[PDB]
From Swiss-Prot:
Zn(2+) 3 binds at residues 35, 37, 51, 53. Disulfide bonds: none annotated. It comes from Homo sapiens (Human). This is AN1-type zinc finger protein 3. It comes from the Eukaryota. A zinc finger (AN1-type) spans 12-61. Zn(2+) 2 binds at residues 18, 21, 42, 45. The gene is ZFAND3.
Amino acid sequence: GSSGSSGSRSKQKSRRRCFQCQTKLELVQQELGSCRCGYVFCMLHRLPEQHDCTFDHMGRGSGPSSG
Ligand SMILES: [Zn+2]
Ligand SMILES: [Zn+2]
C-alpha cells in the first residue's frame, strides 16, 4: 500500500498513446489525434466531443446564443 497525494496526478503519461484508451498512435495519428486542449487521442477519441474537450472551438469573438 503506497498512499500520499504528492507530486502530480495526470493521465497523459505518453502522448504517443491515446489519453482515454491508451492505444498505439502511428506517426500520422500522434499528429492528427492530437488536440488543442493539450492531450492526444486516437482516431476514435480524437474528436473533442468524444473527450468532452475543455477548450472552446467557438471563439474569435462572442455573441448572443438565446433565440
Ligand atoms: Zn482513444
Ligand atoms: Zn481536446
